[PDB]
Design a protein around this ligand. Structure first.
Ligand code: HEM
Length: 184
């Protein structure tokens, strides 16, 4: 179960964040740690497509090779805080699992600049019991977290030392698919 009402960044710049480009997860913290594998990789694209606010997600377990993409149109709750009903798709946007009520995530941008971000998400997927997930993002998949984003982690009353890095997993991303999926 999720327990946090994450606070969005003061002054969040939506057009910069949702610019159509890719964000890579470099580090994550699940407050129910035993909810997600210790070795993982994930990335997303975020942008407006034909007037609609969109995200495209990619998940890859580097040990099991379990792979999936998602696309969602984000609904606005407040600036920097969204609710996203997702559909599982292949890399070309063909639907594998349609949108349905009860399959959604919340998404809060706690901090962002041009290169880095800190987000919170709470996933709801049917009857699974999932907890709060924080992720440090960067535009560069290999970037070490800098002081702006690590300070933001502190300001959220979190300890960056507890985050798990995704960097040592050889993950390789299909950026082209993530960008194109924004339209799907
Ligand atoms: C930007 C950040 C992330 C968002 C918005 C996000 C969103 C989601 C969504 C929507 C699903 C369900 C997909 C579907 O069934 O179609 C999912 C599943 C999953 N995510 Fe994430 N995720 C993110 C980061 C991560 C990270 C960093 C991990 C780390 C370990 C992770 C682990 C998982 C796992 C293991 C599942 C499969 C749940 C299951 O069905 O059993 N996610 N995520």
């Amino acid at each position: 179960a999720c327990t946090k009402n994450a606070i969005a960044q003061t002054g969040f710049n939506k057009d910069k964040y949702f610019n159509g480009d890719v964000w890579y997860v470099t580090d994550y913290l699940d407050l129910e740690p035993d909810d997600v594998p210790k070795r993982y990789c994930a990335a997303l694209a975020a942008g407006t497509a034909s007037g609609k606010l969109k995200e495209a997600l990619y998940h890859y377990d580097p040990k099991t090779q379990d792979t999936f993409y998602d696309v969602s149109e984000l609904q606005v709750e407040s600036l920097g805080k969204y609710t996203a009903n997702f559909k599982k798709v292949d890399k070309n946007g063909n639907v594998k699992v349609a949108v349905t009520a009860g399959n959604y995530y919340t998404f809060t941008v706690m901090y962002a600049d041009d290169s880095s971000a800190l987000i919170h998400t709470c996933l709801h997927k049917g009857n699974k019991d999932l907890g709060d997930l924080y992720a440090v993002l960067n535009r560069n998949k290999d970037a070490a977290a800098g002081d702006k984003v690590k300070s933001a982690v502190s300001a959220a009353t979190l300890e960056f030392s507890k985050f798990i890095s995704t960097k040592e997993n050889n993950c390789a991303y299909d950026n082209d698919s993530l960008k194109s999926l924004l339209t799907k």
